[PDB]
Amino acid sequence: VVGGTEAQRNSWPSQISLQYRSGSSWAHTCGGTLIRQNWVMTAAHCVDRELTFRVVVGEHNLNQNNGTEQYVGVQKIVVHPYWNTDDVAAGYDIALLRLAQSVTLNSYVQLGVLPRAGTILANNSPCYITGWGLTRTNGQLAQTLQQAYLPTVDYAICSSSSYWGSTVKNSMVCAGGDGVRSGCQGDSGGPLHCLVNGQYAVHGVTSFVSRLGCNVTRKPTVFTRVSAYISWINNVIASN
Numbered sequence: 349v350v351g352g353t354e355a356q357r358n359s360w361p362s363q364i365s366l367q368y369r370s371g372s373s374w375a376h377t378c379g380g381t382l383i384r385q386n387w388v389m390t391a392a393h394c395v396d397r398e399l400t401f402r403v404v405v406g407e408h409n410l411n412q413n414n415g416t417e418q419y420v421g422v423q424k425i426v427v428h429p430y431w432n433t434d435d436v437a438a439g440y441d442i443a444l445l446r447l448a449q450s451v452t453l454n455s456y457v458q459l460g461v462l463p464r465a466g467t468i469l470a471n472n473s474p475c476y477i478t479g480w481g482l483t484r485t486n487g488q489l490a491q492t493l494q495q496a497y498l499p500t501v502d503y504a505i506c507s508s509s510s511y512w513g514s515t516v517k518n519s520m521v522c523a524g525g526d527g528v529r530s531g532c533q534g535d536s537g538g539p540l541h542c543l544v545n546g547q548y549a550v551h552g553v554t555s556f557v558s559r560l561g562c563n564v565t566r567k568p569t570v571f572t573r574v575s576a577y578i579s580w581i582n583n584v585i586a587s588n
């Protein structure tokens with residue numbers, strides 16, 4: 349998160365860190381959203397490498413014991429059947445991970461509330477992106493969870509010439525684009541939380557930014573529109 353602020357410890361409890369095994373250690377690669385005590389929603393591109401992965405719920409400071417973390421292994425990865433590694437602009441950048449154990453819910457670990465199927469947010473809707481990714485373009489991971497106020501840019505505006513054009517599809521949410529605040533590498537998979545009827549709901553899964561830089565005027569951060577995937581999500585959790 350470029351142009352972010354430090355999140356309070358309990359503000360966003362459905363946020364997880366997706367980490368992979370590096371030598372004796374574990375490194376953060378992506379965010380996610382806890383959606384069931386044993387299921388995480390993240391972006392499909394986050395698990396395209398065949399790495400050993402773990403999820404950390406209740407995490408705040410990556411590099412420090414918070415006294416609130418639960419570590420759980422990933423048991424099963426279901427990516428969207430239509431996801432293509434070579435074409436992120438096609439969409440379908442969503443995956444579901446079955447955890448090896450059910451996590452315990454407390455004020456640090458909560459399930460994220462999903463939107464009703466088909467819900468589109470009006471332009472300039474109040475949303476927040478959270479994550480541990482790069483705080484500058486080509487910078488470094490944050491060690492505490494950051495948040496940034498990122499209002500949505502609706503599809504007409506976002507798919508216009510000036511903006512993402514043809515690269516954005518109606519299965520995506522655009523948010524931000526002011527050249528100051530943005531999602532950046534390592535925030536992929538994470539939540540875009542939007543305040544709806546007095547309730548925060550997870551409307552985006554972070555998917556991409558520009559090839560030119562994270563915080564670029566008129567190139568909003570792009571998210572998988574979660575409400576486009578509610579029947580697939582339910583259908584996976586029911587069977588698996």
Ligand SMILES: CC(C)c1ccc(NC(=O)[C@H](Cc2ccccc2)NC(=O)[C@H](CCCC[NH3+])NC(=O)C(F)(F)F)cc1
Pocket residue numbers: 377378393394396433434436485486531532533534535536537554555556557558559560561562569
């Ligand atoms: C400055 C220049 C090197 C530059 C190049 C690319 C970007 N970023 C990008 O275009 C964004 C990174 C990103 C994702 C989500 C949120 C924020 C940022 N990258 C993506 O869309 C890829 C998805 C690859 C799909 C194929 N397997 N994301 C990533 O792999 C991740 F996790 F590291 F962030 C930003 C800057």
Ligand SMILES: [Ca+2]
Pocket residue numbers: 407408409410411412413414417
């Ligand atoms: Ca920690």
